[PDB]
Amino acid sequence: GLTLALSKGRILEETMPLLRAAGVELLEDPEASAKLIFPTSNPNVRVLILRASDVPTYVEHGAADFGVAGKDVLLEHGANHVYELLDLKIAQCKLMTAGVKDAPLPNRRLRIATKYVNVARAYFASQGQQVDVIKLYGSMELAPLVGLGDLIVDVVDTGNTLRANGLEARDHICDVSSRLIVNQVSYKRKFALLEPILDSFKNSINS
Amino acid sequence: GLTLALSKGRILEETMPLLRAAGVELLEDPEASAKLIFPTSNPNVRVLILRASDVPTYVEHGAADFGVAGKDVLLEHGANHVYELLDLKIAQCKLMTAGVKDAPLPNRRLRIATKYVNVARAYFASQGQQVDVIKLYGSMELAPLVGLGDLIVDVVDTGNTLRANGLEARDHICDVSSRLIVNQVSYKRKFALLEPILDSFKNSINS
Ligand SMILES: Nc1ncnc2c1ncn2[C@@H]1O[C@H](COP(=O)(O)OP(=O)(O)OP(=O)(O)O)[C@@H](O)[C@H]1O
Ligand SMILES: Nc1ncnc2c1ncn2[C@@H]1O[C@H](COP(=O)(O)OP(=O)(O)OP(=O)(O)O)[C@@H](O)[C@H]1O
Ligand SMILES: O=P(O)(O)OC[C@H]1O[C@H](OP(=O)(O)OP(=O)(O)O)[C@H](O)[C@@H]1O
Ligand SMILES: O=P(O)(O)OC[C@H]1O[C@H](OP(=O)(O)OP(=O)(O)O)[C@H](O)[C@@H]1O
Ligand SMILES: [Mg+2]
Ligand SMILES: [Mg+2]
């Protein structure tokens, strides 16, 4: 059958309506289980629950035939060995730069504190800046408060996180939504299983 | 004053008794707050709550003067630009290799699924193996079930996680406890503040 890689929180929550419309429901709540492999109402489809970071890794190697990944994670991971088939328009946010509100930029090479080191470098390169990048894994909004780095790059949605910590978004880098990715082989070998799920999602997202 | 980097869960929980003995208590529970900078009973000491991965990063750059980091995270991060001053003997576990119980090793170059790619490489190198490493961020115990990689490297404590997923530990790599690390400059510049806290911890750990 098909293995679908998802992640907890917004992607699991916001994907389920798309799955339900396509004839696929989980038989329990993965948020409440230690389990990581879940059957569905469709015995041709099961689900993996992974860290957001690992969804492309699983789909690339074909541990999963397909997954739902944030565009931020694909941009950072590189998506050269998976096919991006659909923009699902869920878990919508922005990649942004940010700093202490009204904090002047220092006139030296910039230090960007981010999980998204490759996106930070590419974005600053497009703005004419070779920056240094301090790699972190969470709570990017702490970095500028303690003077770790001049700016951060992170996902902004409401901007509540930035505002609460006295930060403000400086640049918008790009819009981020979750994307349906397929294993390059799975697409060739199990398309008959993928296709009616792809067509259902495509129709669902139009609404 | 001094900034102490800690992380949530076991390290925060198991460090607090050491801090209390040294005259330092948090004025609230960081597990229940969105906040990330916490004053203490000691107005010369405040606390950062970070991802475990980021504690050395903060201490290295001196965003934090000192922190409590797992030895697994120091080994993987490299600890060449911090001083390891004490083995606190908390959050004790092992770095181990593991696979499907009784699964034979394939007679090709090995694929290790781990967060600890540098530890995996070093350990397999000491065993005469140049392995490939599939980088992941969590739920290492899923990898072998779906045939992502031949083995995993991960922290084992009770082994409950391995057993529940039908995995077994193959090799013990090394013992892991949390370590007190200092910024190389903070050690030189604020030793008068560090010393009585260091002496208290050292005494505490003897018991
Ligand atoms: N506030 C938000 N609103 C909407 N979408 C978001 C928001 N924050 C993140 N996302 C999107 O959701 C994806 C996954 O979010 P999630 O919180 O699971 O990631 P994470 O912080 O890396 O998780 P982990 O704790 O496993 O590292 C992101 O990669 C991004 O595309
Ligand atoms: N089961 C365990 N028993 C004891 N110590 C543990 C156990 N698991 C991990 N540790 C130790 O605790 C440290 C931090 O644990 P924690 O669970 O916060 O890490 P993590 O999974 O990277 O967290 P995050 O979700 O932020 O990525 C580890 O680096 C290790 O030294
Ligand atoms: O702009 P806002 O609406 O404040 O949202 C932005 C935040 O949302 C996400 O946090 P999440 O809830 O996933 O916490 P975590 O990812 O740090 O665990 C993300 O990590 C951002 O920090
Ligand atoms: O050998 P055991 O006693 O089963 O412990 C080992 C597990 O403990 C930790 O999990 P944690 O509770 O930190 O979950 P997480 O790190 O995967 O979030 C670690 O990630 C190991 O998987
Ligand atoms: Mg998150
Ligand atoms: Mg953990």
Residue numbers in the entry:
A (entry chain A), B (entry chain A): 23 to 229
Publication excerpt:
ATP phosphoribosyltransferase catalyses the first step of histidine biosynthesis and is controlled via a complex allosteric mechanism where the regulatory protein HisZ enhances catalysis by the catalytic protein HisGS while mediating allosteric inhibition by histidine. First, crystal structures of the Michaelis complexes of the activated, hetero-octameric holoenzyme (henceforth referred to as PaATPPRT) and of the nonactivated, dimeric enzyme (henceforth referred to as PaHisGS) showed Arg56 of one of the catalytic subunits reaching across the dimer interface to form a salt-bridge with the pyrophosphate moiety of PRPP in the active site of the other subunit in the PaATPPRT structure but not in the PaHisGS structure. Therefore, allosteric activation was proposed to lead to more efficient leaving group departure at the transition state by stabilisation of the negative charge build-up on the pyrophosphate upon nucleophilic attack of ATP N1 on PRPP C129.
In an attempt to gain insight into the effect of the R56A mutation at the atomic level, we solved the crystal structures of both R56A-PaHisGS and R56A-PaATPPRT bound to PRPP:ATP. The active site interactions are very similar between the two structures, except the electron density for Mg2+ in R56A-PaATPPRT was not well defined, so the metal was not modelled in, and the hydrogen bond between E163 and the PRPP 3ʹ-OH is absent in R56A-PaHisGS. The structures are also very similar to those of the respective WT enzymes. Therefore, any structural or conformational differences that may lead to allosteric rescue of R56A-PaHisGS catalysis are not captured in the static view of the crystal structure. Surprisingly, the apparent first-order rate constants for R32A-PaHisGS and R56A-PaHisGS with Mn2+ were measurable, 0.12 ± 0.01 s-1 and 0.13 ± 0.01 s-1, respectively, only ~2.5-fold lower than that for WT-PaHisGS with Mn2+, although still very low in comparison with those for R32A-PaATPPRT (~54-fold higher) and R56A-PaATPPRT (~20-fold higher), suggesting the more efficient charge stabilisation ability of Mn2+ can partially rescue the activity of these mutants.
